[PDB]
Amino acid sequence: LRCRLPGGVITTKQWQAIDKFAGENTIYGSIRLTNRQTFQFHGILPVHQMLHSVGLDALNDMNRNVLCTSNPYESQLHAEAYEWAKKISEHLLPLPRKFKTTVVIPPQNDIDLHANDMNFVAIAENGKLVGFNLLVGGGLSIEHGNKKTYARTASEFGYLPLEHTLAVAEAVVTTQRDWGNRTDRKNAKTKYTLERVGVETFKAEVERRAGIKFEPIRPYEFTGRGDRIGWVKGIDDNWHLTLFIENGRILDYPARPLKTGLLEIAKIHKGDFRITANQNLIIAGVPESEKAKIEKIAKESGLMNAVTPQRENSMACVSFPTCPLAMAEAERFLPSFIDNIDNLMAKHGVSDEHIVMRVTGCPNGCGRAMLAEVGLVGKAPGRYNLHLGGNRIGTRIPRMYKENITEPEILASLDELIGRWAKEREAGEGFGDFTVRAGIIRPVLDPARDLWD
Numbered sequence: 001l002r003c004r005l006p007g008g009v010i011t012t013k014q015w016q017a018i019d020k021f022a023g024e025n026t027i028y029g030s031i032r033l034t035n036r037q038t039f040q041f042h043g044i045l046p047v048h049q050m051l052h053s054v055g056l057d058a059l060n061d062m063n064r065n066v067l068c069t070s071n072p073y074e075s076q077l078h079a080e081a082y083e084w085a086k087k088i089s090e091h092l093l094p095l096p097r098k099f100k101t102t103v104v105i106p107p108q109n110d111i112d113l114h115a116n117d118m119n120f121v122a123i124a125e126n127g128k129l130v131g132f133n134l135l136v137g138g139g140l141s142i143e144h145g146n147k148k149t150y151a152r153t154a155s156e157f158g159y160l161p162l163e164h165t166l167a168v169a170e171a172v173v174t175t176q177r178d179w180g181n182r183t184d185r186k187n188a189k190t191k192y193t194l195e196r197v198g199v200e201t202f203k204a205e206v207e208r209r210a211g212i213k214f215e216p217i218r219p220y221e222f223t224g225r226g227d228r229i230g231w232v233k234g235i236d237d238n239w240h241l242t243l244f245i246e247n248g249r250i251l252d253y254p255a256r257p258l259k260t261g262l263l264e265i266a267k268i269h270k271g272d273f274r275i276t277a278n279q280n281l282i283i284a285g286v287p288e289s290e291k292a293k294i295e296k297i298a299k300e301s302g303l304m305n306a307v308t309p310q311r312e313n314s315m316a317c318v319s320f321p322t323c324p325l326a327m328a329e330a331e332r333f334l335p336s337f338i339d340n341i342d343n344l345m346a347k348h349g350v351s352d353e354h355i356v357m358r359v360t361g362c363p364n365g366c367g368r369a370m371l372a373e374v375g376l377v378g379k380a381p382g383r384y385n386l387h388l389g390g391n392r393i394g395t396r397i398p399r400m401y402k403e404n405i406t407e408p409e410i411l412a413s414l415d416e417l418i419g420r421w422a423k424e425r426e427a428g429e430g431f432g433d434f435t436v437r438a439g440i441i442r443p444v445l446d447p448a449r450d451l452w453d
């Protein structure tokens with residue numbers, strides 16, 4: 001069961017309702033936060049009455065949860081951008097393949113825009129959103145050894161004033177709907193359609209249908225994709241506490257009652273929560289007077305246990321035991337794998353650094369390994385394809401470095417590479433960029449043509 005939850009914003013009342021159901025009506029008893037800012041129950045022995053009772057709904061609807069940057073540096077931009085993610089979501093509510101959409105607030109690419117079909121990058125002037133740059137065609141799914149499939153980054157179409165948002169959203173969806181491949185579902189996705197007809201052809205059709213002309217792209221840059229773990233000052237006297245939740249798996253573990261702690265917080269919390277695209281949770285809108293109260297609960301429940309910057313920037317998909325398409329472990333492999341990476345980082349004197357590292361259980365790519373600096377793609381039990389060369393902001397697809405290897409083999413490759421980066425990197429140079437500059441891996445410049453060797 002997966003909930004429709006635009007922007008990952010969930011009230012404390014809704015949380016308490018899902019917390020109950022998770023504990024009493026599912027085999028696993030957990031709340032699993034997903035990387036598309038929503039949650040999932042595993043092993044449901046219905047849920048819809050419960051969701052519906054607190055104003056929630058579980059999603060042939062070929063649409064997925066609409067994402068929205070969760071913790072913007074310019075705190076006041078969230079409300080507006082959130083409002084638009086909600087409107088786009090409702091507007092699109094009832095395609096060849098599933099359609100994924102996001103609303104992004106630079107300089108954060110926490111939502112990983114390049115893994116999505118349609119992206120609206122917020123352009124603000126004087127603290128007010130004035131429009132969006134539209135990027136179309138991202139998608140990460142591939143099939144092992146099938147060179148007709150590929151991960152692709154989204155292409156820039158142009159800028160549009162706020163007023164044309166919904167018309168443009170509708171036009172992209174309908175154009176993809178009509179032009180999408182009408183036979184092979186593995187080529188139905190927008191990324192394939194764009195490559196077949198061309199960005200300019202697709203863009204012109206969208207302008208025709210929307211009844212507008214795109215203006216030139218407005219300047220925007222991204223500085224990162226991680227969450228802002230800990231306390232950050234929001235608007236007024238409000239604060240936001242982002243809690244790192246390993247694999248987004250919320251359950252009470254011996255001596256770390258993560259699930260109970262969150263329930264205790266939801267009961268005294270003023271504002272609401274925000275599920276992030278990094279499978280974490282933000283206790284949003286905490287008045288200064290309440291910080292100590294919230295921090296005490298989070299602290300004692302083990303929700304604020306300090307982890308390395310590395311662990312904070314690593315991600316894995318669900319995979320076994322519940323995913324029927326799983327080829328190798330991901331969520332259950334990540335904790336001990338990062339324990340090992342942490343050692344490597346310490347051994348090389350880069351314990352304060354991080355490499356965006358992701359593990360996906362099979363090539364479908366839910367863990368977003370195809371946008372990581374170091375991506376692990378499951379191929380069989382205990383075996384993964386190792387990809388290197390993405391960047392910190394997620395605008396480049398990592399090329400396959402080694403194929404079908406085991407963890408010990410992976411660790412050995414990384415020990416050597418991290419060693420070289422540690423000593424040969426320029427001031428503030430990321431790992432992915434380093435492997436490409438140092439000639440360790442050739443960059444993927446045009447995925448549709450040079451992703452596969």
Ligand code: SRM
Nearest residue numbers: 034035036038115139140141316317318322323364365366
């Ligand atoms: C929970 C999540 C991974 C996580 O650990 O967070 C996940 C889990 C699953 N995904 Fe996904 N996907 C998740 C994000 C994505 C991502 C990343 C993203 O959207 O940001 C992708 C890659 C980008 C992309 O779409 O290209 C992704 C691409 C897929 C695909 C391949 C789609 C394709 O176009 O080929 C499938 C399989 C399919 O639909 O054929 C899939 C299928 C599935 C299913 C439902 C398996 C199935 O079809 O029966 C997995 C359920 C496993 C389980 O036991 O819970 N999932 N999946 C994410 C659910 C997000 C959500 O709330 O909607």
Ligand code: SF4
Nearest residue numbers: 317323326361362366
């Ligand atoms: S990438 Fe594969 S194994 Fe992981 S959750 Fe998605 S479908 Fe399952």
Ligand SMILES: [K+]
Nearest residue numbers: 245247278279
């Ligand atoms: K996490």
